């Protein structure tokens, strides 16, 4: 269902960081917690954001017109 542009708690920009997170894994083969420490996401408010969002859109895009 796409990356939640900016966090709910503090709102700190977070709609870009997505692709970079997904990569700091499949490729840079890191672990969640750190991957996020790497993308600047410090305090949990913004953390839980990525670490939880489910990018459904992909399964959506996979349909038709």
């Amino acid at each position: 269902m796409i990356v939640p542009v900016r966090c709910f708690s503090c709102g700190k920009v977070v709609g870009d960081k997505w692709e970079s997170y997904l990569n700091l894994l499949q490729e840079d083969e890191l672990d969640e917690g750190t991957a996020l420490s790497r993308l600047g996401l410090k305090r949990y408010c913004c953390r839980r954001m990525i670490l939880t969002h489910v990018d459904l859109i992909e399964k959506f895009l996979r349909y038709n017109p």
């Binding site: 399964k59 996979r62 349909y63 038709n64």
Partner: protein
């Protein structure tokens, strides 16, 4: 050799096209996987 009525088949059961169908198939049949 005569025909008699229609049986409201169950979904995802053997007599359902979906029973066989997979990933792709469904998404194209619109049917949610």
């Amino acid at each position: 050799k005569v025909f008699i009525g229609r049986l409201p088949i169950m979904l995802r059961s053997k007599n359902c096209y979906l029973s066989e169908a997979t990933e792709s198939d469904l998404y194209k049949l619109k049917e949610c996987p």
